[PDB]
């Protein structure tokens, strides 16, 4: 049985003109083959995983870690979305602060 430990990470986007940046990369999504996930516990997990964190970027200072699984973003579930949907949820230009619920640990 799986019990995920979730914690929060608040990222403050960087606005370089018309260029909004979070400073991290995401992989996964229900439309992608999960057997290829390089972090996942269960190779059938189609969740959204953080694959990279940019040095000196907002995500780094916020505490996001490579390998973290994104469960939610500003209230929106991220457990069963397509890669594109995941991206759209994390790229709302009108939002400056993106609040995340992530898991980098299981219980036991």
């Amino acid at each position: 049985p799986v019990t995920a430990v979730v914690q929060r990470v608040e990222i403050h986007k960087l606005r370089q003109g018309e260029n909004l940046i979070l400073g991290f990369s995401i992989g996964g999504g229900i439309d992608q083959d999960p057997s290829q996930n390089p972090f996942s516990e269960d190779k059938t997990d189609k969740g959204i995983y953080v694959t990279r964190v940019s040095e000196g970027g907002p995500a780094e200072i916020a505490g996001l870690q490579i390998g973290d699984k994104i469960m939610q973003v500003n209230g929106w579930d991220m457990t069963m979305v397509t890669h594109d949907q995941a991206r759209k949820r994390l790229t709302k230009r009108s939002e400056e602060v993106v609040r995340l619920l992530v898991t980098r640990q299981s219980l036991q």
Binding site: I21, S25, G27, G28, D31, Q32, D33, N37, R52
Partner: peptide
Amino acid sequence: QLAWFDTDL
């Protein structure tokens, strides 16, 4: 068919 891949944000 579609492989696992990542995108930068």
